Symmetry: D2
């Protein structure tokens, strides 16, 4: 009966374009949906080595991996077996702007992800093209309903070389495939994403994320 199982697999294919540079990246990972933890092994098939910081791709690599408590409606786990899809905009503080789409589907213990990524106006001397990023700092997403659609806004920062921070503002719009899926009320989703390991050219990447939902102070 259960559409969401304790241990599930993740199959992902990304096709993208940043500043004209086409790229194709494959993923194959595992995760625990009810614990909000997933890990994935990536491998760029085309366009390696990448000319930009790999970090800007990480959040495009499923909120069905998040620990939802009882008092908050879990929109994403209720979206399967049919699945869902999202759209995202990434506005960086130095002009660089990205859009991204993902169409998620399920078969058995496996999620399938059709991911698209596009970025423009990234300056050559910028920390993205200079590859001076280190990690995404831990963040907190704001979930709320906007125009009948579950939307998530995140203020977010990249750690740069030299104790500097690089600002990125994101908006995601989630839409279930099935009709009649209960939209949740306002809530927060704490995030944490990390590159566990990589080779020199970032042709091989192991990514890990942890996400938890809550109602904020003083409920958490």
């Amino acid at each position: 009966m259960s559409a969401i199982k304790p241990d599930m697999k993740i199959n992902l294919r990304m096709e993208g374009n940043v500043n004209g540079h086409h790229f194709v990246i494959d993923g194959d990972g595992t995760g625990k949906p009810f614990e909000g933890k997933q890990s994935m092994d990536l491998e760029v098939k085309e366009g390696g080595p990448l000319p930009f910081a790999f970090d800007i791709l990480t959040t495009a690599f499923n909120r069905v991996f998040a620990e939802y408590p009882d008092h908050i409606q879990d929109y994403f786990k209720q979206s399967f077996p049919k699945g869902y899809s999202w759209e995202r905009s990434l506005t960086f503080e130095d002009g660089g702007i990205c859009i991204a789409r993902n169409d998620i589907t399920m078969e058995g213990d496996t999620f399938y992800n059709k991911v698209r990524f596009h970025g423009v106006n990234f300056p050559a001397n910028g920390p993205v093209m200079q590859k001076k990023t280190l990690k995404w700092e831990p963040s907190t997403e704001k979930m709320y309903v906007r125009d009948g659609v579950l939307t998530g806004d995140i203020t977010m920062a990249l750690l740069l070389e030299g104790n500097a921070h690089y600002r990125c503002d994101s908006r995601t719009t989630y839409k279930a495939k099935e009709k009649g899926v209960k939209l949740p009320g306002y809530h927060l989703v704490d995030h944490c994403i990390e590159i566990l390991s990589h080779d020199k050219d970032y042709n091989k990447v192991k990514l890990y994320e942890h996400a938890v939902a809550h109602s904020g102070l003083p409920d958490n």
Copy 2:
């Protein structure tokens, strides 16, 4: 050393939104180390306010935040000298607000010289029409930007009709005593609430609670 477990709070706030001057006085208390604080507010001039009182609340001290041991408390170490902050509020309908505050301490009480200015609020907007309900809980991102500690918040106002209203805020904190160590990147959980008020919002009770943390998985 300079901050007692219980403190008194005094706040004078003059402002202008859409050409409307106003003067508000605040007298309340709070326990800094526990991260909680309360305050009674009175519109001594400009009442009744033709705009939603909620936009003023965040202007009405991060020293009232529960900081752990593993995170540098830049605000509690800014005393007895005190500190200042500037702020910019950017609402989604075009309304822009700026604010500043000088925080001092003579004895056991906190003195706050706050100013507030807001422009370009739409007439039928949820602010000038008082369609707001409360500030939804948020998370401030603390990080050093150009040698100055900076807090950025994506906060949302709950409106009437189960709708939310966007506001992006950037605050720059500056300690008076030169030498106060800047903290690393960290988060500050926030929850603000109007506990009680009258019809025309002349007398208002405000309450806050702030907890600092390292985020996942250290929170």
Copy 3:
């Protein structure tokens, strides 16, 4: 410093592949124009994805700055970018959250320019003017051309006229990069724009587009 190889009467060969709100489409373009008068006209034709569930207007500026009246006192970065050609990247930010990215690779071969165009929009509200197709007209705008991070960049403040006398704000930044080296960067200058849909069918499967652009250096010398 060399011959632009751009004759006063040029042709345009365009093909756009794009995605908006998950909806995929393919559009082809055929038109003519005069680079020295800063005027051009094109016949668009939705090959795939028709009919478009969104406003056609958001696509129109994606459908070449080589068609702009540049005075000889202002450096014409685009005309001197040929015969090698150039390419641009653009971000479109609407006031309701909708964000578009677009890029065009422009080449010249003989008498005709060629455009490989891509367009991507996200986060448009279901009841916004775009998805409801309540747009009417691109108001005349002025693009601010200047070198930024060693790259010629243009910033505009655009507005769509809606039904009911309302305006739909949009902020656009375009970056321009030449394929050949040695092309001189211009100083700050303005570019006046006026794009207009002259004719179309009901479902906008076939559209007739027109642009007129004139560069200048603002008051008082304009």
Copy 4:
């Protein structure tokens, strides 16, 4: 039918607070409304010398000084003799944000301007606090009505040392004092502001503006 003379005098006094620095500037000049030109001598009464770039203030130092054609409704000259007021937000690309107000009342032959200005969050090493600005480039104001109010949005740029540019996005709201003043349609207003002369620390500044209203191409 508005009692606006071809040659008018301008009286002005600004009180402001940028970066915590309080200041007072007085202004006295003349202008030609139907030719859209105006000149003004400025004097720093308090706060001198200003620790920030003077250029960020000049845009605040009256749109009746704009040449309007006959096919465009001149909302500003139709607001007198009762006068009008405006509000403005200045958003810079580096985080610096300014608000500004002015109440304009006409007393016979002289225009009076009660101006207020406030600026926050300017980086210590930005071109403003370092005073690296050279001038405002000529721009174009997009006038249109939003929620029953005349509004102008401008993409303007400050020329910096080395011929770099410093972006600023601005929005102004105009409100006539008298009820039922006919709102104009979408039109453009070309601007140029130029500091003609100044003293060492900008305590005395000669300012000039030239504004012309039009309806864009091909009317240009």
